[PDB]
Amino acid sequence: SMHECNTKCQTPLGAINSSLPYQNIHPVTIGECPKYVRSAKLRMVTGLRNIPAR
Amino acid sequence: SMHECNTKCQTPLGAINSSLPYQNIHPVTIGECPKYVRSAKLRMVTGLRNIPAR
Amino acid sequence: GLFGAIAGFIEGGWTGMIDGWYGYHHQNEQGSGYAADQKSTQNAINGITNKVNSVIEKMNIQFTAVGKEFNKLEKRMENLNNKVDDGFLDIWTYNAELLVLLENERTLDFHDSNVKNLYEKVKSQLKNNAKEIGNGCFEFYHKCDNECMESVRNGTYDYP
Amino acid sequence: GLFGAIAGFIEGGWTGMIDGWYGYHHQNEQGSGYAADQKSTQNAINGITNKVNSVIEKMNIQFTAVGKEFNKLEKRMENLNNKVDDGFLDIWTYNAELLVLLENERTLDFHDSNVKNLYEKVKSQLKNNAKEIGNGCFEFYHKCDNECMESVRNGTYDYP
Amino acid sequence: GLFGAIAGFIEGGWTGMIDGWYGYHHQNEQGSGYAADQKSTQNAINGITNKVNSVIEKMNIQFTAVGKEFNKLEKRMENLNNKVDDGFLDIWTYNAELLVLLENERTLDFHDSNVKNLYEKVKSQLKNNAKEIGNGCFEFYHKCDNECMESVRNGTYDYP
Amino acid sequence: GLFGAIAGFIEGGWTGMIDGWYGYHHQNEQGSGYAADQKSTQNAINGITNKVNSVIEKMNIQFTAVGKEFNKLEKRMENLNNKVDDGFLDIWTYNAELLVLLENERTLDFHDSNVKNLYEKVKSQLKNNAKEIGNGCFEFYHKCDNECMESVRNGTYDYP
């Protein structure tokens, strides 16, 4: 349903307000969306291996 | 303008989702709204007089 | 202050207490630090919570209030509607601000009272064992422990 | 991991470190505390920030991708369209999970590298004045200050 | 208490003292008993009687007020009548119950005031002839009679 | 009253006070006279000016309000006009005399409070250098001049 929201991306499921490179929402896009990928998790590590020494 | 939102109170300016006793938004109300009052501030103190002693 | 404790004989509050609205600062050989008086802090909190509840509960929630139309030969009934709505809005705005003003004055006087009654309880405990130095502070003559310092918080303190 | 420092010769990481990813813990007569080695931590943060930027930069933002209808005598061109859309989405999903597994391994290997580089710079610096105990811990033979522990952080330390 | 005498330094009230709201419990070798302080009791009774008369007199008696009929084409003037009757009933209930809550505190604070005012009046007679022992109880130094107990009631006993 | 100085142990006020609401009387060998305590007078005046402004400013100026005519078949809307105008006038009379009694009560306690706050502040300065003689009057042991009297006025005189 239409609402007075405004976003750089639209898909059939809803609008996407993100700066993440990939998305798994819907392949059909309108305007500047993230690239569609079928994966359920694409999480990169930035820190090191957590071993609390507990 | 009408949107797919739901609230216990409506006024001509917009819907009010609050548990505060008073409001100063608009006199015309629909449903379970706070009491309309012309005041710009009805802040009551609960703490003591702040003197940081800096 | 209406009791002369807050901004009076005690000049200012301590930012180092976070545990309550009233507390003490010790100066034992075992160290220093801030520690709330639980009883006066809870009695003040329950008093002020019942005050917050009372001013919210005693006025009822507003139901649907909607303005009515009046034609070219009903302008007396329009002016009846107008002065009813305006006159109700006057008395609700009148009672709202006067209740806030009176209860804000009272709240600060009630906190000033709770600092007074706390200081005077410590005076009735310590008595001959300490003198008034900083107006709020009590130099011990016998120099007792952190356990005896806690015995002044709960307020037993078994020494003349 | 691939360098035997993280989960290896140092048994586990310290939760008392918050200042940086790699750091030391002194046990002087001046007391104890966790203090990050800034140069190794910041160089790792630059290496991680550059990889994080790179993998986001290399994909270009997906413009309007709209579905195309084909009639009852164009089902070959629908099967060309569907094969093209599926085959690109296959390859792009494979590229995304490839670089996630590969670079997450390389990240843990890179941090494990930086912890052995942190240990070997301290071993080559403390030399004949200290021995290994807990594999990471260096008992001094002369007992020097927290200023001299800072001299091992910055990597000066003027005594063989 | 706002003055810290009722439920404060004096722990509780006496069921054996029935002659007034305040007074003193004498203890002698001649015998023990209760005796009201007529001055503080009567000034409190006059102050509370004028206070109770004030709010009763101030709410004037409601004259004849009945329901009005309106036909099928008079629903706006019926709902103006309803808005007027309900809005007056809101403000009269609100003002009555707030006045009760407020005045009930001011009465209890006034009684707590009169106990501290009576206590400090006896303290300013027994300066160096007695010491405080029970938080309300003064033990004498020279052990004076029932006449001396009555002299401390009536505003005399000007001993050092 | 509520604090026990005004009509309390300081039995009456001085007609020799003309510069302020509070102050001290001279009894030194340099001669008798009166000198107002400026800080207690000004803080009382600022509190009184704020409550005087608050009660005047809060309810706005009453604009044009005139009588309305009603014909022989408009007796219901005439008695609605009368019920509204009388009912609001009941509330405005009731609210005016509520605030007048309550603010006059609190004003006399506030002034009675300011005599406590000034009395205790001088007693905490004098301590062991002067006794109590006239309930207000504090007789000096060592004796001192009019400049040493002025030191007790201005908030200095820090002698055990």
UniProtKB/Swiss-Prot annotation, chains A, B:
Recorded superkingdom: Viruses
Disulfide bonds: 9-33
Residues carrying covalently attached carbohydrate according to the record: 17
Record protein name field: Hemagglutinin HA1 chain
Organism field: Influenza A virus (strain A/Puerto Rico/8/1934 H1N1)
Taxonomic classification: Viruses, Riboviria, Orthornavirae, Negarnaviricota, Polyploviricotina
Residues of the full protein shown: 287 to 338 of 565
